[PDB]
Design a protein around this ligand. Structure first.
Ligand SMILES: *Cc1c(COP(=O)(O)O)cnc(C)c1O
Ligand SMILES: *Cc1c(COP(=O)(O)O)cnc(C)c1O
Ligand SMILES: CC(C)CC(=O)C(=O)O
Lengths: 363, 363
């Protein structure tokens, strides 16, 4: 069955925290708001959802979330427009992805719309926390963990779903659009076909920390994840990858890797594909990309822009790739970056309510 | 720099739990002892280790252990012999495995001997909980988690190392080995070359729960994990696999897959290889086993015994494998299981102190 937002229990905070003021640099996922959403499950079902003050979790030492990684998360943003209204970006897609992640880990189902409604209520209570400055937003983090106090590797009979909010400035300092360099090393695999790399589970991120440190040691900010013996490009860091070029057939196109089990189905990824298809100015395609194909197109000058996508960065340009000890300059910045700046402009218009669109969910 | 056992702080329980009653049944990992080990880490390094009463952990909702799976665990047993002396089985190997797992997740280093000494002290305080009945033991569970209250995927600046203990009953009730059936389906992948399946990390276990349910649905108790297009046998459930046969060259041998990156380096696995090498009665090798080889060997009646190894079960015989909807009978039980019984007899002698051996660490 499921919990209902109409059953929502409200417990307002006693002691409010100090909201940061603008002019104070907002570091990603570090400052939290006053309230949190909390919903408990056991085998007789879901309990009553509650908005309560932000507090620590009390977990039994044998909780399956801490031993066997029965944990998943989501990430979406709420934006404050010039008309002072708070809106969420395509939250239905996040609700679908979360449900899919829960099912893969044998965590309990919930109703997508009820969760969305409770998240909405949570943002309404903490509304004054959504910043009004340029390029800032409220990052919403829903989490669902297994909470069975047992060391057996089995389906949990206890679970906990919580949501925390944090003001974020994203960070491209004053709009910036500064590029990043990537380390492409085949020795490091993020995900395998028949694995879980296409789900937003906690277990796929922990192993990436060391690889990220190895990229920094070699002079790169992020990792270009390769898969297979033909070195297919999959993701940049924990962002979806896009290449804008003139393909081998002489046609100008925007290509992203297709949804096999190795790519996380990004909400910004889908949005970029939909938006570009709507224009109809160039070919928009999901197709595999190999290092061999990229190397060749670079030597031929057929590549215009390479970039990453995700909720945190929105669109992140790429200017350098380190591959098999060789440096590869990607002319993204020297080419405007024209497409990137365009995507950025149109998203901002939809996100901040400058232009009305059905992608925004009002709070 | 590491914590020191000499700095141990003790805080005894004021409220002890009741030991086994209203029931003699000890289900794996469901009953906990009175005390736990707890050691915190931050910028000024490790804190002072404390043995304190068994209590709930207080975690910040943004703890990296819960979002990004910065978590690892170990598992070993302590045994009480007839002479009332509690001993640990090859704990040095576990200490090395834990250190290796910490390093792969960028969790803080510690001194292996100091942790072992602290674990020894914890078992000494809870010595009365170590059962003495036949086939029973004390399961020791060390865990190390990242505890940074941040949503950024980075190296944690806070960490928590805790150890909990639990009395476990005999895996085979009444001392008679009962076999299990395995589902071998290539669509399911546990680990990949260049991945993290050779480390005991929480993230490798959560995805196996659904596959286990799928196995049950089909009348099998466990999963035979296959890897590659050549369908190499890797592990049985979360145990190492062994096959006792006469190879295509006419030689009687015990074989197990090599540590190629997708096999967890089992302490029991190593012990069986060492013990069998010491006898010198048959060939003992680490070699790749493919489904094709097993099928040819079964058709020629060259297979004697198939089994799983791990701390929990010790030695688990296999009698059936369901592969590509076809049932395969493994004559393990019809063949004694001679090798299994022998391995079991010799382990029990070493574990319960009947025979003096350097593998035992006295508490
Ligand atoms: C979250 C995530 C993305 C981007 O998804 P968005 O919905 O666009 O935020 C891409 N790749 C990985 C690995 C991710 O975890
Ligand atoms: C723990 C474990 C084993 C067995 O190791 P032991 O040290 O023998 O307990 C085997 N396979 C997996 C996947 C494991 O996690
Ligand atoms: C919190 C991060 C793991 C998610 C991310 O990198 C993104 O939104 O692009």
């Amino acid at each position: 069955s499921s919990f209902k937002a109409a059953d929502l229990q409200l417990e307002m905070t006693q002691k409010p925290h100090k909201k940061p003021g603008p002019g104070e640099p907002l570091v990603f996922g570090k400052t939290f708001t006053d309230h949190m959403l909390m919903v408990e499950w056991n085998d007789k079902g879901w309990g009553q959802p509650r908005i309560q003050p932000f507090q620590n979790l009390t977990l039994h030492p044998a909780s399956s979330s801490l031993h066997y990684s029965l944990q998943l998360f989501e990430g979406m943003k709420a934006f404050k427009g010039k008309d002072q209204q708070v809106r969420l970006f395509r939250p239905w897609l996040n609700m679908d992805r979360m449900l899919r992640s829960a099912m893969r880990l044998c965590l309990p189902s919930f109703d997508k719309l009820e969760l969305l409604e409770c998240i909405r209520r949570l943002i309404e209570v903490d509304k004054d926390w959504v910043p009004d400055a340029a390029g800032t937003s409220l990052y919403v983090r829903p989490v669902l963990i297994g909470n069975e106090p047992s060391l057996g590797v089995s389906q949990p009979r206890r679970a906990l779903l919580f949501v925390i909010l944090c003001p974020v400035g994203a960070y491209f300092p004053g709009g910036s659009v500064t590029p990043v360099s990537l380390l492409a090393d085949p020795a490091f695999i993020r995900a395998w076909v028949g694995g879980v790399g296409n789900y937003k589970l906690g277990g796929n991120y922990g192993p990436t920390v060391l690889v990220q440190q190895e990229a920094l040691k070699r002079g790169c900010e992020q990792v270009l994840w390769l898969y297979g013996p033909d070195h297919q490009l999959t993701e940049v860091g924990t962002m979806n990858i896009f290449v804008y070029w003139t393909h081998e057939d002489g046609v100008l196109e925007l290509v992203t890797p297709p949804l096999n089990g190795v790519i996380l189905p990004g909400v910004v990824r889908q949005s970029l594909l939909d938006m570009a298809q709507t224009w109809g100015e160039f070919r928009v395609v999901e197709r595999t990309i190999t290092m061999k194909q990229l190397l060749r197109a670079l030597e031929e000058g057929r590549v215009r822009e390479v970039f990453g996508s995700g909720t945190a960065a929105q669109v992140a340009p790429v200017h350098r790739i380190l591959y098999k000890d060789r440096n590869l300059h990607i002319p993204t910045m020297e080419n405007g970056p024209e497409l990137i700046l365009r995507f950025q402009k149109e998203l901002k218009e939809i996100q901040y309510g400058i232009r009305a669109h059905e992608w925004m969910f009002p709070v």
